[PDB]
């Protein structure tokens, strides 16, 4: 189900090539024949508008699109009824006979789950959760628990809903805690780091992603190259260079992951340039990471500017720690940028107290302000010490 949501997401924003939309349309047309995408197929016009979202022959009549395959017709209307009779009408009649004959226990619960998964592809979520809720009481061990969690896990990836999914996934996992192997636990662990990108948790996302394996592929839930970009980009932003040398840049799987596909451009272009402290070619890597990684990915396109703006602030901190002073002529020219471009980035960073530095105008020397023995007891002990005392006085001043 994720293969369609990944390819059709390129239909939303394409600023360069038109063929990217037609190439991604070939994967959509192939999957809609085997499985009915009608809930997401109708969600195409309800997601992003004023591109392809105005083209429909049924609910709303307008023609504006670069893709004519997303509009209903007489063929898809007949196929919608054929898939609805086989996956629901034909299967429910056989399950109804098993209910009266009393055949098995978990077999009827698993049959309701497989039947409930078909309502998700027809576009009716009321009967999908109704048949799933009846089979939830029959779940005891991890045999029927994986299938119940699998249906709710689809709600997050297929319907792109971060609200009612995680609340249900946590309730099912916390009811009976076993986990089976480590891969069945990834469904809760991988979606955890993915949900952190919606509410912008930053370093919290990479907690379970860095320790996760790079060979994990959920197919219909997620692809191989999609999860590879989530752990590479978020893991690089979380762990500092101290932890990058013993984990990211040197790993048995990660070194094998970068050679599989060239669509990462994170653990190779960004990591080596950061480890070698080469700022000449490091700047164009951020543009390739933004265009060819962040934009095509689903959850990596939500932040947008929040990647390059924050990553550029931290890469300067690695340079400020290795020198007391610097050269403004070398930073604003030799690294591939201009003078006005450097003052715009550092202009917003200084008043936010995100770093300690000394910028020179006439002399043109970038000097680092080093606390020496001050460290974390200088401005943090007074701010965090007295700041928490303000929260302590909240309930003590007003009582109840």
């Amino acid at each position: 189900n994720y293969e369609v949501s990944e390819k059709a997401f390129l239909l939303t924003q394409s600023k360069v090539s038109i063929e990217q939309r037609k190439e991604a349309a070939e994967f959509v047309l192939a999957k809609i024949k085997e499985e009915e995408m009608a809930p997401y197929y109708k969600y195409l016009c309800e997601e992003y508008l004023v591109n392809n979202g105005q083209s429909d022959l049924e609910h709303d009549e307008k023609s504006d699109s670069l893709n004519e395959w997303i509009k209903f017709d007489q063929e898809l209307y007949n196929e919608l009824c054929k898939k609805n009779e086989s996956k629901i009408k034909e299967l429910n009649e056989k399950i109804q006979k098993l209910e009266e004959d009393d055949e098995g226990e978990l077999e009827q619960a698993q049959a309701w789950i497989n039947l409930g998964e078909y309502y998700a592809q027809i576009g009716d979520k009321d009967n999908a959760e109704k048949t799933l809720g009846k089979s939830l009481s029959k779940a005891i061990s991890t045999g029927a628990k994986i299938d119940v969690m699998l249906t709710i896990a689809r709600l997050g990836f297929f319907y792109n809903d971060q609200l009612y999914v995680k609340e249900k996934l946590e309730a099912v996992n916390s009811m009976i805690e076993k986990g089976g192997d480590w891969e069945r636990r990834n469904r809760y662990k991988t979606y955890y780091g993915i949900h952190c990108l919606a509410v912008r948790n930053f370093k919290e996302a990479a907690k379970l992603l860095v320790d996760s394996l790079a060979t994990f592929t959920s197919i219909e839930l997620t692809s191989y190259e999609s999860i590879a970009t989530y752990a590479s980009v978020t893991g690089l932003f979380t762990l500092e260079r101290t932890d990058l040398k013993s984990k990211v840049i040197d790993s048995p799987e990660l070194l094998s992951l970068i050679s599989t596909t060239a669509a990462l451009q994170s653990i190779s272009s960004l990591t080596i340039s950061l480890y070698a402290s080469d700022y000449a070619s490091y700047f164009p890597y951020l543009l390739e990471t933004y265009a060819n990684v962040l934009i095509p990915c689903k959850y990596l396109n939500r932040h947008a500017d929040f990647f390059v703006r924050e990553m550029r602030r931290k890469v300067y901190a690695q340079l400020l720690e290795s020198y007391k002073t610097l050269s403004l002529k070398s930073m604003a020219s030799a690294f591939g940028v201009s003078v006005a471009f450097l003052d715009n980035d550092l202009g917003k960073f200084i008043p936010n107290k995100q770093l300690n530095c000394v910028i020179d105008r006439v002399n043109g020397i970038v000097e680092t302000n080093r606390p020496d023995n001050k460290n974390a007891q200088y401005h943090l002990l007074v701010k965090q010490g007295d700041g928490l005392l303000t929260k302590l006085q909240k309930y003590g001043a007003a009582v109840r």
Binding site: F283, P284, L287, Y290, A304, D305, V308, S333, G336, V337, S338, A340, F341, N344, D345
Partner: peptide, 19 residues
């Protein structure tokens, strides 16, 4: 935004490579 950072990076590359 991305339009500001990408524009200033490409315009400087044309001038820097000509020096």
């Amino acid at each position: 935004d991305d339009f500001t950072n990408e524009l200033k990076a490409e315009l400087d590359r044309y001038k820097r490579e000509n020096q």
